[PDB]
Structure formats: C-alpha cells, structure tokens
Scaffold this active site. Structure first.
Site, short mmCIF file in Angstrom:
data_model
loop_
_atom_site.label_atom_id
_atom_site.label_comp_id
_atom_site.label_asym_id
_atom_site.label_seq_id
_atom_site.Cartn_x
_atom_site.Cartn_y
_atom_site.Cartn_z
N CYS B 104 36.56 35.69 49.74
CA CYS B 104 34.91 35.29 48.63
C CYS B 104 34.14 36.18 48.60
CB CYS B 104 34.44 34.23 48.76
SG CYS B 104 33.01 33.72 47.85
N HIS B 124 36.03 36.51 45.10
CA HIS B 124 35.13 35.73 44.03
C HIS B 124 35.06 36.83 43.06
CE1 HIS B 124 32.62 32.95 42.59
NE2 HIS B 124 32.91 32.25 42.99
#
Lengths: 186, 186
Positions: B104, B124
């Site tokens: 992420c 992400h």
C-alpha cells in the site's frame, strides 16, 4: 453522526473485528470498540491484542447505537453467547428496531439470545449446524444476507462486503461507493 | 518453523497489519509483531490500538526472519521510512537474500532505504508518484507483484492476496490453498 457499537470478546476473529471498524470509520461513523470483559486489552483468536475504546458497561450507557456489530471467531462468539449484558443490549436494539450485524460464528450469539427468529441468515459454513439447531432461522449461502434489521455474513473473506453493507444501511449507497474505491477491492 | 517480522508503527493501516498477521499464523508461521517505537500499544490510522508482541529492538536480536513485512498507511510508512533501525533490518534482509513484503504506501519505505532498486513493484495508486521518484523501480498495476525477493501489493482490498502470496513463498502452494479455503474468499 451514525454510531456503531462493536462488542469485542476474547477469542474474537481479529480480521472480522478490524475490517468493520476501519471501514465504518472511513464512512464517518462514530465507532465504539467495547470490551466485553472490561477496559483491558483483548487477545483475539490469532493472538492479535486489541485495546478497546471502552468497557461494554460504559459503552452501553452511551447508546443507543445505529448498529450493534458482533464479530466472529468461535470462542469470541461463545463468550458473546454466554453474556447477560450482550443479551440485554441485543434485546433492546431489536425492540427499538435498530440494526444488528453479525459475521462468521457471530450469528450464533443471536440464536443464544433468541434474537431475530424467522430471519434469513448466513454464517461461516462450519457454524451452520449450530445456527440452525431448532430451525429458528432460514439459512442462506449468500456472502452477505440482510433480512431487514438482521445483517449476517460468512467469514474473514466476506468482511469487506459485510462492512460495506453496514455502511450502505446507515449512510447510503453513495457513501459506500465512495469508501469502497480507495480500498482496491476486486 | 518459518518466521515473520511485522514492523508496526503509529499510523499503520490496521487492516494491512492484522490480515497478514492472522493469515500467516493460520499457515503455521511464527509471527512477531514488533513495535517500531518500543513495547507500547500502537495507534493505527483508523484508531484501532494494537499491542505489539515485542519492541523492534528486542525482535531484531531474535532474527533472522524468513520475511520482513511492512504494512501501509501513509503515516505508518513515513515512520518506517524515517527509521534507522528499519534501514538496518531491511539492508540485512536484502543482503542475506531473504524476502521483504510491503503493502500500500509500505513500499515507499523501500525507496527511502534504497532497497530492491531495479525491481518491479506496485503500491496503492495514490503512492505511485512517491514510489517512482527517480525511476528506481518499474511500476506494476498487478494486485500483488513479486519480483524475486521483493513482494508488494496495493491496498486493504489486496491484503488477503498479499498475505497468501507470503504464505506460498514461505510454506508452498499446498499450504496456501489449505489456509485459503476456510477464509470464504471469493
């Protein structure tokens, strides 16, 4: 401005606890993680230790809540099933026509406390027989089942779907969609 | 018998922390959740408070580990990026040819510590530009990316895929499949 009560007992499935708390806070819901046993840290099923925001005793005095959430985990659900305090919270939530959401073995606490009989429900596959003892509910294999004010789901892998169903019920479809996109769900 | 070190910093994404810890323990991996700042409870990005198993200082003395895992969360990843202790752990893991897994914004700590340059990576979507500053990596949109001993993933919604990729890397495909089935993933 909507409010959620998450009841956290020793042996709870930590994924089924944290995913709904996090997703509901992303939706702007005020979430209270309440410890069944008191204010002390709670050892979850896979040994993650979570510090609750309050004891359940204190959190109840601050209700009512728009949703009461029961995580799964077999021993967690057993502890919820044995608690007189949980019984009173769920009965009061049923009576005021508020949402009750339970995931995985969590719905077996609804059975224990005689909540929502006559509803369609799902559970983890391994909890089906316990939930269906007496034929008080109608079983579903849907990943999330919502029969009015009883919302149930099946397992860690349905926890995002479960949490976003809570968000939609409380805050609407547009908020649920907005919360969902940054999560990188498939 | 395989061992994992999960480094937990304030502001970590709690879902990206708990899902890998739980899934790896389901796989029989010995997981140490180590607090970056010490032994005290850690306030995650959505205010879940997690009590680590040990401080990072203590956990390092107990290595080496088969995998070092870096959760995401922007402020968590920033704290990992600023830590000299993390730098030394990652450099040593790289040097001994051990797996590093980051999800992420987590992979931006690899950039900070000059780990794995030349690898294909994902993050992400909102962390892409930071990760790609200088063109030291090759970017991927795959939900999980594994380029040898650097394993990356994109967000809360890829956390199960990320964790099961770790399990497969350490314990093999047969264990990952066995762990996956009870989770009720789609």
């Amino acid at each position: 401005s909507k409010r959620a009560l998450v009841i956290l007992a020793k042996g709870a499935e930590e994924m089924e606890t944290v995913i709904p708390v996090d997703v509901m806070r992303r939706a702007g819901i005020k979430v209270t993680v309440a410890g069944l046993a008191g204010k002390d840290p709670v050892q979850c099923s896979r040994d993650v230790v979570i510090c609750p925001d309050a004891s359940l005793e204190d959190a109840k005095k601050e209700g009512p809540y728009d949703v009461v959430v029961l995580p799964g985990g077999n021993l967690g659900a057993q502890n919820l099933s044995e608690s007189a305090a949980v019984k009173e919270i769920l009965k009061e939530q049923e009576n005021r026509k508020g949402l009750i959401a339970a995931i995985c073995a969590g719905p077996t606490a609804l059975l224990a406390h005689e909540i929502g009989f006559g509803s369609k429900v799902t559970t983890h596959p391994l909890a089906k027989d316990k939930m269906m003892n007496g034929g008080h509910y109608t079983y579903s294999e849907n990943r999330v089942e919502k029969d009015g004010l009883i919302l149930t789901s099946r397992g860690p892998g349905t926890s995002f779907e479960f949490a976003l169903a809570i968000v939609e019920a409380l805050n609407g479809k547009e908020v649920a969609a907005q919360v969902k996109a940054p999560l990188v769900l498939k």
